[PDB]
Symmetry: C2
Subunit: 379 residues, 2 copies
């Protein structure tokens, strides 16, 4: 298969499979007092430090989770609660319209279930949000519980201005969370140096085990737990510590962040060649999202007029090209593209294992496939 | 080096390690519509089916979680909320005082934060709780949102009468959850045959990978999610499905539950040899928790008068005997009527699928010396 669905998941690094199988062969609960316990404990502590190192955090800032979704729920609901509980006036969530469901659905739920209110930051046709728009919604609202803004979008690849949005949030004394699940090993990540109160990351998105993640959280931000007890993870997130998955995520984190520079460069070329080929050989197609240097290196997103994206995906699949439609995408809606127009969408995404031929394959196959999808949609 | 802490974690089955390795070698998101995706989906759905079969559930009753803590949390909070939100008067949780912390602390947080109320069922000297006591609690309260009683205790080994308690809950139309985390691979569990609205399990306790569990939940019992953004698992629990872990948990479930009868009897003989040994060679000691036939096959739990559990543990460890104090002074012993002073010299020795004769021999050899040192160490620090 030509695999071009890296943004949905990317192949686990062989070395991470190996490091993880080796933990699995030793016995021990990291919570236990005996020799096996203190070993496991020391392995989980080394993984935590390697992770913090590679994300510009301090080891104690890393709260392991069972994936991106968990991490995003914890930040959003946890912090909302902590803030609302201490000052019941503070009920407003400021967030973007282009968030992953993991955030949006968390937000909508706090709204329906927890008396939350939400202000949606306006979105550019880019798919971006700006530091100013944040300042404007912060100044005109005295009831901001928290802020959540994603670092890079997972459908259209737009990088957001987090660093400078963070300094804004700091200014108003408002904790800011960012979903950086698409960022690890794709752009430079420095938790400490960003202003962030909280940051989400997900193993499998950079060659880690699936079912493991982290929330980076600052020592002084209160967060009400979603999982009780008794707080194996800084009293924020209970459950028996999963050492094998932490170790897996660490090895991954290390390969992926050390290779950040070289790999970005390699994927930009591959992706630009793909974007170029696509627009050269196909009529009525456009790129969505931002241009360099405000886009993920590995991401290509199109709309093909007069197509169903589902038809398209199935025809490409039949020919050995594996990709995704991305989702009527709330993210394209947010960028002011229209319902009809938008159903013709396709995300093609590359990662550590992509090669020239994967691009040669997509370009070979695509025109035949878009023709067929258009024929079919014409009835 | 004798491992006697199987109740905290049991060694992963090597076939479960292999199956999991194999999955992580293939690429695919189970929610993806292309070929690799459909393969991932086909793999997770088979694991699910294997798990259902082995636990007497229908496939769609199985919801994958990140472990037993997640599973207990989802059941207790999520069903509470589903009940409270439908009839704001049902705010009461009926539970036992012996529950694992993942239930106690969930119950507590609901009390502190979500307006819950709690009635604690009375606990016998045994560690045990009865169907009658549940009856009286449901007759005498008209506001109960949810019942949660664990199938077997993780400290003292006691098995509770879930089938007959489940029936009582059914008669007052109140959903019941049971933490069965200790029961899988040690007891014949059949979600179908029990009346349970819900039941929790954790892979690592019967030899599956860490950070994977399941909640078994009836098709008609509503449950508010704790993880949103998906919800990939019947809309109850979001997250990209973890295919490797679930296949692992399945490979383990089929070994654990097929070996059930054989393993059970084998551990009984070991445990019993272990308990008899201890009581012969040591003074002022007792066994805690119910007797056969209401006790897990691999669980031995003792109190030694005149010890700190910690010094005793460190001594045993120094001599290659690895075990636990159980907690957390144990809330379980407190609830069985054991006083906090007496409580303090407690020790859980727990057998599992890799347990061999030599393990019990090692414990029997080292124990008298250990106990005697712990007693002397306790007197001299009071001195």
């Amino acid at each position: 298969s030509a695999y071009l669905d890296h943004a949905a998941t990317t192949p686990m690094h062989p070395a991470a499979i190996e490091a993880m199988a080796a933990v699995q062969r030793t016995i021990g609960n990291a919570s236990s007092l005996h020799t096996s316990g203190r070993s496991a404990r020391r392995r989980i502590e080394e993984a935590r430090e390697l992770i913090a190192d590679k994300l510009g955090a301090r080891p104690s800032e890393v709260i392991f989770t069972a994936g991106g979704t968990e991490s995003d729920n914890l930040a959003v609901k946890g912090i909302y609660w902590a803030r609302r509980d201490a000052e019941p006036h503070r009920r407003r969530i400021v967030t973007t319209e282009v968030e992953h469901h993991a955030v949006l659905d968390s937000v909508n739920w706090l709204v329906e279930h927890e008396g939350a209110h939400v202000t949606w930051l306006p979105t550019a046709a880019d798919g971006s949000v700006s530091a100013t728009a944040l300042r404007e919604a912060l100044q005109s609202h005295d009831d901001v519980a928290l802020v959540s803004v994603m670092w890079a979008n997972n459908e259209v690849g737009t990088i957001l201005p987090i660093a400078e949005m963070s300094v804004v949030a700091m200014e108003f004394g408002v904790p800011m969370h960012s979903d950086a699940i698409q960022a690890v090993g794709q752009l430079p990540l420095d938790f400490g140096a960003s202003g962030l109160s909280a940051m989400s990351v997900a193993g499998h998105k950079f060659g880690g085990p699936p079912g493991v993640g982290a929330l980076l959280l600052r020592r002084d931000v209160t967060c009400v737990p979603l999982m009780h007890g008794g707080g194996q993870e800084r009293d924020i997130r209970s459950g028996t510590p999963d050492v094998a998955s932490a170790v897996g995520m660490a090895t991954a984190a290390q390969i992926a962040v050390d290779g950040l520079e070289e790999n970005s460069a390699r994927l930009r070329l591959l992706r630009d060649r793909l974007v170029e080929g696509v627009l050269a050989e196909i009529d009525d197609v456009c790129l969505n999202g931002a241009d360099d240097p405000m886009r993920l290196a590995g991401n290509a997103h199109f709309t093909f007029r007069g197509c169903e994206g589902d038809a398209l995906l199935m025809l490409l699949d039949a020919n050995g090209i594996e990709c995704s439609t991305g989702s009527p995408s709330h993210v394209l809606i947010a960028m002011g593209v229209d319902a009809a127009s938008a159903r013709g969408s396709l995300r093609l995404s590359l990662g550590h294992t992509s090669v020239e031929a994967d691009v040669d394959a997509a370009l070979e196959v695509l025109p035949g496939a878009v023709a067929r999808a258009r024929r079919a949609a014409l009835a």
